[PDB]
Symmetry: D2
Subunit: 502 residues, 4 copies
């Protein structure tokens, strides 16, 4: 035969991305797109097909040092622009992300696997942080504080902290980049970001659009490869004043310890193990829809995912039946195909963890209501699963599954469920469903979690502060408060001041 023999299954999509200038195979340091110093690379694979999409550089310490130096050089000028000037440029970036949302969504699907509707939704959500902080840049207010000394006047100024090092995970290849880069740039900081080596392409496309928006070279730098070597260069640098990380708890704890030697500002978001309480007086349809959305978005691979569901005795049977019917409607497959609502797990390690959790639960008495095996598609597709008769001795109760498995734990009293929900070292998201005003407010107040969905399974938004309590993190992303993570307060005391006349 004669004809095109593609190496991959989605060449038309990759060609369209490349024609749009959104398909990159190099990192970004200052005013250049670059390879690693020795030309080494790593493959980026499509999780639904196994195919290599492209190689990207395998960078380390030296490239990270060069990126930090570029960011440090760019900081002086960027930080001294007016807020209005930074705001205009950031809005241009926001507009370009939205203009390119359909192609950027497809790029997320290719490298990370989620359904196209979720990927395009991630562009809209991620871009919203850029818009939000473009507006908030102009609202970094200082204070004039009444002085108890007649001869003194007291001010508070808020100024950018300096060069920021940012590390982002694979589960939201765009939004985890903008949630960190947007506030940093708005405040007047510059950044060195290390996206996940599993999903770097979307970060590179976002950086290309930042350059097109007029973000000066060196304000945004993107490096990837040897995550440990890059992270150590970020921690060892004097010029890096702040480090922001989202990812695994074990890695985050090491980063936080390492940041202590230079007293860096740190914000981080780590593992969660979100409880969801369905009370007897929940609106059943609202609860089923909210739990389905909160558990199975991104095939369970979200930091705010519902991990365990406590269901009150009176509603248990009706909830379990309606929830199983809802879960049975999910469809796994390649995210570029219409009607697909579950993508593959990111890799074999993730699949093996899901299988370990399910095997442990079934060995301790859990009942498989739906699913409980690898999907017929193979690879890293796992059937959406519900485990009935779950308990506090199970691995899935104690640890974050990060997959499409919903364990149900029966409970009797409200106090019992709230105390169980609060009995862990996690503190990211939690959820509750009840129609009663007193009960709803009480549960929301009582839960020891940074976010609470009350009659809501989809809580993500750029306007509100997201982050963890206890061992789930430090600091917040989104809202006015997210910008404070990138600022230093300064108290200025003016002396030898005079009394007003007449």
């Amino acid at each position: 035969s004669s004809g095109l023999v593609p190496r991959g299954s989605h060449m038309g999509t990759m060609v369209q991305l490349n024609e749009a200038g959104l398909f990159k195979s190099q990192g970004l340091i200052g005013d250049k797109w670059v390879d690693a110093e020795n030309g080494h690379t790593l493959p980026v694979n499509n999780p639904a097909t196994g195919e290599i999409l492209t190689s990207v550089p395998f960078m380390g310490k030296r490239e990270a040092e060069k990126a930090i130096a570029a960011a440090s050089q760019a900081f002086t000028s960027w930080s001294k622009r007016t807020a209005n000037d930074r705001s205009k440029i950031l809005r241009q970036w926001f507009n370009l992300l939205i203009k390119n949302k359909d192609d950027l969504g497809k790029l997320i699907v290719l490298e990370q696997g989620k359904p196209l509707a979720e990927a395009v939704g991630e562009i809209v959500y991620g871009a919203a942080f850029v818009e939000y902080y473009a507006e908030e840049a102009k609202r970094v207010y200082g204070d004039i504080i009444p002085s108890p000394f007649p001869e003194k006047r007291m001010l508070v100024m808020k100024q950018p902290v300096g060069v920021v090092a940012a590390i982002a995970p694979w589960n939201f290849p765009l939004a985890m980049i903008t949630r960190k880069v947007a506030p940093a740039l708005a405040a007047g900081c510059t950044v060195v970001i290390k996206p996940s080596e599993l999903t770097p392409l979307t970060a590179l496309a976002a950086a290309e659009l930042a350059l097109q928006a007029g973000i000066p070279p060196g304000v945004v730098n993107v490096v990837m490869g040897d995550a440990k070597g890059i992270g150590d260069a970020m921690l060892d640098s004097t010029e890096v004043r702040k480090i922001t990380f989202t990812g695994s708890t074990g890695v985050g704890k090491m980063l936080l310890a390492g940041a202590g030697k230079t007293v860096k500002k740190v914000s981080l978001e780590l593992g969660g193990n979100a409880p969801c309480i369905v009370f007897d007086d929940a609106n059943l349809d609202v609860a089923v829809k909210g739990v389905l959305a909160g558990k199975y978005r991104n095939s369970g691979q979200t930091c705010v995912c519902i991990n365990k569901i406590f269901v009150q005795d009176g509603i248990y049977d009706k909830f379990a039946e309606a929830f199983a019917k809802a879960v049975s409607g999910l469809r796994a497959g390649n995210g570029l195909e219409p009607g697909i609502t579950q993508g593959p797990l990111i890799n074999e390690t993730a699949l093996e963890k899901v299988e370990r959790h399910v095997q442990d639960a079934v060995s301790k008495g859990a009942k498989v209501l739906v699913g409980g095996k690898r999907h017929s598609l193979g690879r890293t597709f796992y059937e959406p699963t519900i485990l009935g008769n779950a308990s506090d001795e199970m691995l899935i109760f104690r640890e974050e599954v990060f997959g499409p498995v919903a364990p149900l734990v029966r409970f009797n009293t409200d106090e019992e469920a709230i105390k169980l929900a609060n009995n862990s070292e996690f503190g990211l998201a939690a959820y509750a469903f009840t129609e009663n005003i007193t009960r709803g407010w009480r549960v929301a107040e009582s839960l020891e979690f940074g976010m609470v969905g009350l009659n809501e399974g989809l809580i993500s938004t750029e306007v509100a502060p997201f982050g963890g309590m206890k061992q789930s993190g430090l600091g917040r992303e989104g809202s006015k408060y997210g910008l404070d993570e990138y600022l230093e307060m300064k108290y200025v005391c003016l002396g030898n001041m005079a009394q007003p006349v007449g």
Copy 2:
């Protein structure tokens, strides 16, 4: 002879303190004043006389664990009181500190050595944090954020973080206790505090007055002795959610690293190396008075102390002459004696550091204008000193002296002085003197320091945020912002909400 043979030189003062119930020889754990588990003790000595004032317990890990358990038990009830209820109790504590200020001032003099006027001033200043946060407790405002989803409503709540571990240094035996304890208690947290083993008595007296105010047992706990063992118990505890430390940079960096393993919230204030810029157009009298106060308060032993003075070429001679005349008016001695304005350095290690700094400067060309030797009183008294012709190669330029030594560095241009002032890893206080509005605002904006005194050498106040940039710290103490260090934000998303009618 017949008659009283006191062991110390200030028995009348110690008897008056004891009669007032302010002289303690035990720690405080829950509802009991306690010894160490094995009865071991450490002496607390008067630095002006060498005499033992009293012994206090030499506690460690086990007592710290018991104090944390008491704080954890007390937290449930204290955190659930209304803000108004906590506020009333904290105001009672504030009133008792002020009522007892003269005796509490004398206790600081005995254990730490500063002049009585400075010690009574420290009570007024330290007590002011108690008042401030009693008022601010009622002003922990949450938010209602406009929701971009018509069917959702969005709230932000702010709630106490939990048990706090606090470590305080010796240079402000009262104010470093209240700066940490007051916001923690106001927010609804409970505390375990380890005062300096050099100056624990004032902390114990403050805790006695807290009990008299109606602060419930276990809300405030005070332990001391094996600082490493106590600190390790604080870091290892799950229940300790936040740790606040003021002290040496080396110890602080180890604490911050150690806190990473449980993802604790940390705020800390470390070494500073404050530059002071005297421009050619400074008001000479204002500059001399401000530099004298900012350098020599507490014999130079303040975290915000002026460490190095940059003096512009045109004013150099007139400043050096007037400043030497001002420094020559200082008088060293026992802080309980009238007219004394310089107390002894805390210990022999501090004296040896001062001597090392002076010897290094003189070996590199500095000119002793005033002082430059141990005072005739001996012990740890050091003559107030001025070193002319100082330079950036000197130990005193590069490191925190924490003593009564003022080095003068000549400079030519404004830009030169600002760049030199900003060329370190310190970032706590800085000072500038200029009569010009443009120059003054410019220098205040340019300085990379958490606090700036502009035509002011005495900047301390509870109403404004104090803390460090770069390697000088994390977080702030004082002002509305100080309370945020003890709170966790919670976003609550209400779903299935209806549109307003008509």
Copy 3:
């Protein structure tokens, strides 16, 4: 000196009056600057106890001349008071707060004597009224200015907030202490001085409060108290250049005239006027909570509160059970003299108030309302009225359309949520409203939908110093209580610094 001498009129509660007089809290003069004064012509007005008819004392009948002198004293005192630190004003205001609380039992008795409410409610009013003094003593130190990012590189932008100047305050009779402190405390905290005209019906409590202000160290002229010819005093307040802000609580008709009159000198005006509070009891209300809440929200102060429930809309499914349980609750109330323990309803303030209540009840019964409990003057006579419930009320009744200010609760049946909310919003009033529902969606919806400045949701007692109180529509302008209450007494100033330099390095 012999017990038969008549210089002090003999009467009931003489022991209480003697104890108040001994405490320095029983006054028969106004306060202008550093003097307690009579009116220039020695005219007076009597203050009578509404439960007994007995004279308590007389107060001056002052007018224009005395109001001008009080304004001049306040203007003279403003210069120094406004330039004190916030901390200095805060300390003095806390001393006043502490004195009010120290004297609460005697001050409560004084409110009972002149206004009539039960002693427990009067002592509660002292605690509530004094709370504004404490709140604004703290808030004085929290008048924050701003530093705003400048879009011009060479400029820096600040916002300062400074006291407006002399304030004229006019207070009504239903809370003789709290209506004084709600206005005086924020004004003083900001650094303003005040001329206050308390109600001529209940002036004694204001004078006692002013004596305690002087004892607290509030300098003479910072607080001045005048009363008598309300129109003449009000016209002097409006005509004065130096009065920069007026604050008024009282009748809508008088408030509208004051607002119009303030226009000629462009004064800042805050006011709180008539309300006509609807209360919606939905079918899914917790019955006990609704009954208890409506009982409290309607009958406190015998219905004489600005935020009192005026009309209750009850959903068809809960109507019968609510009406029965509510009648049983109301039957427990007991009218009498507020100094007698066990009494829970005092007399209406005067005969005009009683006649308005009788007019509302007669109109309702003539249009088909059913008297479920009460509906007549109490056997005690004077201005005591039986606690009343009118079933089968409608939108054509005077009590539906106008503020009754008395112990009468009309019940209006409704079918749908939307019907009740549209009905509740169909007036020019906009002060308080109330709703009872256990459902989260319905509760938030009703609270958002109601066109009122305050909403009680599963709550009949909403008053607090920490939250902003005031009216929408024709019920008022501005707010009292909360951080926002202090802004009524401040002027914003934008300061633009030019020729500024770029930061170095």
Copy 4:
């Protein structure tokens, strides 16, 4: 169709008018709901170019009936507009902002044609006026409510902020675009609808702005524009129940009447009235900064700004050097038609304005003032007046006491700082003031001391959308620009939730 036909009056700047008409920005009708309309009786008023005397077009002469119809359209549109999300309103307002900026050059020319200012100032006004639209598009999403710590364990306390309702806005002629957007942008952002009456002297720019609002997707009835009988329109705005807030910028006499009239329905009112801005040049001013700043602060818009410098107090030591350098600066100004490049002074708006300027100059010269530059009508005639400086001015002169609104700068010598500050504060005006000093203590002191809503310190050009603008004393109520500007269009609501439970564990 033949060039000799007279349907379109021939004249100067026809190319510009044709380009504006082609762009959809040249209107001869008002806007009520979904229609562009004439007055009910077809009456009109002409709009003439002040530099040429030529007719631009006519606009309707509307009155009470049309204002009532506009209010009804705004009331109908309010229900839906107020219930959109803030994000939805923000997107639409940003589309309007972008359209104003896209059309800035043509809109600038339209301002020149009807109002007369130089084209550079008119295009600058579009950028400044449009900035309010952008600012409040962003601020719409930042209308934050509060959760307040409750002193009652069983209650929770919230503060919500919701749009006030239909707004009536009245704007003057000196900034034909920015005075429209400063009022319309925050109103729309909050969720209010508007009826605006632009100045009958400069209505075209408002109509162009409203066409662009419709193109942006602002629904019909959200913005309505009426003009003609200003008294009849204003009375319809005041008489309407549905108008909940009035905002007015213009003359003090008219503003005081509107404020008085608003009292009968207890409307929220914000207004900005006459100013009489003092400018203090201290002996230690940077001479160049003061000269440049006073030049800009006095002569922008030929002195026809609300914040224009009205009187300059110059300290004895710097007087001679300032007067000499300032005269040299002023000599550079050039009067003419604003469409001619190089022109920096346009004509005064009308003959009444010119006569007031002549009255002020004649009064000053009769009382001893020295004409340093100008002091007569410009050789161009019409309403052009020579830029003038009057030396040796005093407090007995009309120009010291009253707002000149023209290109005349009077200089008053003073000796001490305290003298100048007391003099600057001795009026009933309170809008802008200015000061020039290099000293930090003196600068902060003067800024704190001045009894004015805005202070320029070493700055003669202070206008910005990011900071609060408005007057103290008789210069106004409320603020425009900054986060605070949005509060003028909101009502606070306190919601108290009762029967709440204690948190668990």
